[PDB]
């Protein structure tokens, strides 16, 4: 056995970490946690945190059920400059890297804090570093630390906001393994779980008739449609995403059913596309959203999503038929 979730640190940052000290990064970390609850729906482990006198004076390695997921450093008394794209020239001190974007960084004195600043950098703190590297890595494990525990404790807290919903739900019609599995569908794919009313409303209904996890989620995220359109385009602005060429949509419906299918190499050529489409969006300043019809959208996101995990396939029936659609990136032959 070991911690779900766990942080190894050597001897200099164990101020930040004491209690009985400053504690600055354990207030950074109970802030981490509650904005994750209440913005992704689930609350994450706690971190247990330990001093390992193997590790450097100033580095720390972010576990997760045993497995190193994360490491950096952190320097108490001085700061990290970072160069947010637009920042002009260098300065003197560590030239590292940004531990949750990767961005070109500096750790410099506390001194040369307002030189950084008008150079263009965002200057931060030690416990700032640390807590920005763990709070990146929670949202991107996510899913995996969403363990079967985590949905119990899950399951009782919300069966005091609708009783009748979980008692004759769980686990007589959906088991705590059935719904464990859906809800952490939906977190790898990075859809909120707020709404569990929603959620265990729309098992209640489709869980009779259909047991297989997938197909549940595949009902489960129509049901919450508006969330997901309003996560990716929050208000009333255009929605910006990427589609894919007519003919290929057509074709790829062909393939599942009768007829079909498409050469390997065009299976190559719709991943290197999604590729160019993707790093397209982000220079339209546009999402990294390819949407595509409902019976392609588990099919394209488990093909495509397996080298490019950061791209995010909705379906048709999951957009709000009420907003402004102007495809922005496509993928052809
Ligand atoms: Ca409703
Ligand atoms: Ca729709």
């Known amino acids: 056995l070991e911690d779900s979730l766990g942080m190894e640190?050597?001897?200099?940052?164990i101020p930040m970490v004491d209690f009985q000290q400053d504690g600055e990064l354990l207030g950074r970390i109970r802030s981490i946690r509650k904005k994750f609850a209440q913005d992704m729906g689930f609350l994450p482990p706690v971190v247990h945190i330990r001093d390992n006198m193997d590790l450097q004076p100033a580095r720390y390695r972010i576990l997760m059920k045993g497995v190193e997921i994360g490491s950096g450093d952190a320097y108490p008394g001085r700061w990290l400059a970072i160069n947010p794209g637009t920042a002009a020239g260098t300065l003197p001190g560590e030239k590292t890297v940004d531990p949750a974007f990767g961005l070109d960084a500096i750790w410099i004195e506390s001194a040369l804090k307002e030189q950084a600043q008008i150079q263009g950098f965002t200057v931060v703190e030690a416990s700032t570093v640390v807590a920005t590297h763990l709070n990146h890595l929670i949202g991107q494990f996510s899913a995996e630390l969403f363990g079967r525990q985590e949905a119990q404790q899950l399951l009782?807290?919300?069966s005091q906001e609708m009783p009748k919903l979980t008692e004759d739900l769980v686990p007589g019609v959906v088991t705590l393994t059935t719904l464990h599995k859906v809800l952490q569908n939906l977190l790898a794919?990075?859809?909120?779980?707020?709404?569990?009313?929603?959620?265990?409303?729309?098992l209640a209904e489709h869980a009779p008739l259909q047991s297989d996890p997938h197909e549940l989620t595949a009902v489960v995220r129509v049901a919450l449609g508006r969330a997901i359109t309003q996560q990716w385009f929050p208000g009333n602005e255009e929605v910006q995403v990427i589609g894919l060429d007519t003919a290929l949509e057509r074709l790829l419906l062909q393939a599942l059913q009768g007829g079909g299918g498409l050469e390997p190499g065009l299976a190559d050529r719709l991943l290197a596309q999604t590729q160019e489409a993707l790093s397209?969006?982000?220079?339209?300043?546009?999402?990294?959203?390819l949407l595509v019809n409902h019976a392609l959208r588990p099919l394209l996101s488990r093909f495509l999503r397996r080298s490019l995990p950061q791209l995010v396939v909705l379906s048709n029936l999951e957009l709000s038929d009420n907003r402004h659609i102007r495809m922005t990136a496509t993928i052809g032959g």
């Open 9 to 13: 640190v050597g001897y200099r940052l």
């Open 280 to 289: 397209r969006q982000e220079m339209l300043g546009a999402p990294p959203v």
């Open 156 to 158: 009782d807290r919300v």
């Open 189 to 202: 794919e990075k859809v909120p779980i707020r709404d569990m009313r929603t959620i265990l409303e729309t």
